[PDB]
Amino acid sequence: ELDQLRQEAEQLKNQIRDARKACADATLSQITNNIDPVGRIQMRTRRTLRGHLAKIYAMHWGTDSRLLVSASQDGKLIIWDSYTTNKVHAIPLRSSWVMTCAYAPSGNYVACGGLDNICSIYNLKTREGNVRVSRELAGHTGYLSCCRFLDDNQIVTSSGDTTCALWDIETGQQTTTFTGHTGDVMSLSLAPDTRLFVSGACDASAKLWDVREGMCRQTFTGHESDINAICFFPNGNAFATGSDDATCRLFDLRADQELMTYSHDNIICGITSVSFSKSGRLLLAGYDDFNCNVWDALKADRAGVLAHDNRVSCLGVTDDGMAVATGSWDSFLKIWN
Amino acid sequence: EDKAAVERSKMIEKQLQKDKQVYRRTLRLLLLGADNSGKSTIVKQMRITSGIFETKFQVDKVNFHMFDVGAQRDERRKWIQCFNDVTAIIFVVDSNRLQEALNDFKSIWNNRWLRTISVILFLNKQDLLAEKVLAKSKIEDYFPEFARYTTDATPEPGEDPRVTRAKYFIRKEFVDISTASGRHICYPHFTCAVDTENARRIFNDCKDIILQMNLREYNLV
């Protein structure tokens, strides 16, 4: 009797694919033939942020467009001042294997979670002169893989037990749980309107969720291997991924299909991070062969290379589009402009 | 006046220097015991839904650092990347609850992030094998080449040849996997749950590992 139900399910999966496929009038590449290319982009390193004992895992810009935070295997969070290279804070952690960090939209909190299944919240602006942990969110089973702030109150976490979550900081209790992934989830990104968020997992699929109703909405497939990084288009209607098979793809949101792929035959290593420019004209991706490449988001042309002594692990583009920050496994952060 | 900001930055850097010294003088170790393998006994090293279970122990003024692993589900494909720099890996196995152990051993061997890391393999509970041999150990049932096997070596006195045959049979079943690759080496030991020399064995093994590293550095070999 299981097959009966199974047959009907595969039956549905058959209808979805055919209906989606019978919509492509023309490709994204054809529609951009008329336009002149960006050309050649030369970026020169301006600063070099030093101080980390060991390999770097994450970073996140501040809304102030001047400050940034970074995390390392040592168990350190350091908040920099990207204009004058000073150090503002240096926070030591309880667990040394940390994989994520995020910087609050209002600039009051920073959070980080790692391989010990707990997301920690630190209070930066207090009547004392120290940074204290104010909440320890527990309830996941696998390691945390990403976290992002909504307000001074609500946070979204991704873990290694194939679940996402939405929390409530003052109560400290899980509010909504998003289930449906098969493999462990590697990254997530938010949306400009803070109503939807996307996620990418190691079962080679990406799903779009709704925060209020706590249920899945769509599903995009096409990647051969697991997903390492996901980013969201500034408009709110597209997003791009980066996987272990040396490919970065772009998916439409309300068209529910697969647009231009960004790949070349000289790369065999995978991608660790992706990010956009303010106008969405350039997609820049951090690679595994010690190099970071920048792409034209509309025609897939390599235009510029940001040449680190080890694997590149994180990226970032400032809210107002000044500069780009990169981190790596040899422990130095560089700001390209 | 940003001079006070510069002073704050300099004090932070001064503390980071001390942290670097302490970090650089220490040694890290990963433990990868099996499900029923009694690593709970081997972690009894006080007499010298969480995750990583950090412990610390020192012998003869050298600081060690052993990280167990907690509730990280079942797959180790992704979180094994974080341990690309440890000094050694410490198996614990039980002496058919052996075939899956061999498969796990060969999977942890010949990875892409554990290419240059040596394994300190432990054989735990070496009384189960003795009692099975003396009484129930039909090794030939699932290991047919046991019958056509024999050693010269340096056995331990007060034992029948059967127990030693079994012991070096298992030891060879691991050593052949180790040798079928010379960037790293396996270190098989026959130990028991309640022992005394475990820390000494780990000490000598790490000493040999970094001695080989230094000899490689100045091309003495």
Epitope: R127, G129 | K3
Partner: single-chain antibody, 232 residues
Framework: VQLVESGGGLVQPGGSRKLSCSAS????????MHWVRQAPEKGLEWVAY????????YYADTVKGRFTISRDDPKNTLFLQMTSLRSEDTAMYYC??????????????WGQGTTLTVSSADIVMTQATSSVPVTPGESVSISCRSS???????????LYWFLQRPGQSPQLLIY???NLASGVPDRFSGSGSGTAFTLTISRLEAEDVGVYYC?????????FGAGTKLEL
């Protein structure tokens, strides 16, 4: 967060005294510390300064070889040692907290004070008036005048307003001429052009009466203003 000062008394001229400000309730090892003097019938006046790591010390030009300042981090105690007391050192002394990093608010918390009785090229800050009569329920304005451009190359404008209530220690209202403190009600504002500054209060209640002070922080000599009392 509370600081309590000890010492004081009546001293004959030519003697020496050791004042103390004991800190309890925060991280005393991460804050710069000052000392600020108040003559009985005049505005405030700067005295000394010692930074967090004891690596930098400045003194006011009035007394430089007679006063010395030191700190003791493990016990959370701040010391001032003074020698050869003239007839001018007969005023109130306050110990003031200060922390300097991008976005911080210096001079935010003030001590309680201690009493003591004895038997050139720096920027000049002046205030237009010294009193003003008003009525509750309408806006007021206070004007401050500078003798040099306080605006710096980076873009900051270093001006502070304190508003000492009549009977207790001073507080902080506006730091760097535009930014607001933490616990102050949201009816205060500040504006300026580079040499002339104005402070506006939209409403007015019974807690707004007091004396308002105009401090600059561009260079070490710190020149305080005169003060405009609001009488109701």
């Amino acid at each position: 967060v509370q600081l309590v000062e000890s010492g004081g008394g009546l001293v004959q001229p030519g003697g020496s005294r050791k004042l103390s400000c004991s800190a309890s309730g925060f991280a005393f090892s991460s804050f710069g510390m000052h000392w600020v003097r108040q003559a009985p019938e005049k505005g405030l006046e700067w005295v000394a300064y010692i930074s967090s790591g004891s690596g930098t010390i400045y003194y006011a030009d009035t007394v430089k070889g007679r006063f010395t300042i030191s700190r003791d981090d493990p016990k959370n105690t701040l010391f001032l040692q003074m020698t050869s007391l003239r007839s001018e050192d007969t005023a109130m002394y306050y110990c003031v907290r200060s922390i300097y990093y991008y976005g911080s608010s210096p001079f935010d918390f003030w001590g309680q004070g201690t009493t003591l009785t004895v038997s050139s090229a720096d920027i000049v800050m002046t205030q237009a008036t010294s009193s003003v009569p008003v009525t509750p329920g309408e806006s007021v304005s206070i004007s401050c005048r500078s003798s040099k451009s306080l605006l710096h190359s980076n873009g900051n404008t270093y001006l502070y307003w304190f508003l000492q209530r009549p009977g207790q220690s001073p507080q902080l209202l506006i730091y760097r001429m535009s930014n607001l403190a933490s616990g102050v009600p949201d009816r205060f504002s500040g504006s300026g052009s580079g040499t002339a500054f104005t402070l506006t209060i939209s409403r007015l209640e019974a807690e707004d009466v007091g004396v308002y002070y105009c401090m600059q922080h561009l260079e070490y000599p710190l020149t305080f203003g005169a003060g405009t009392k609001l009488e109701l």
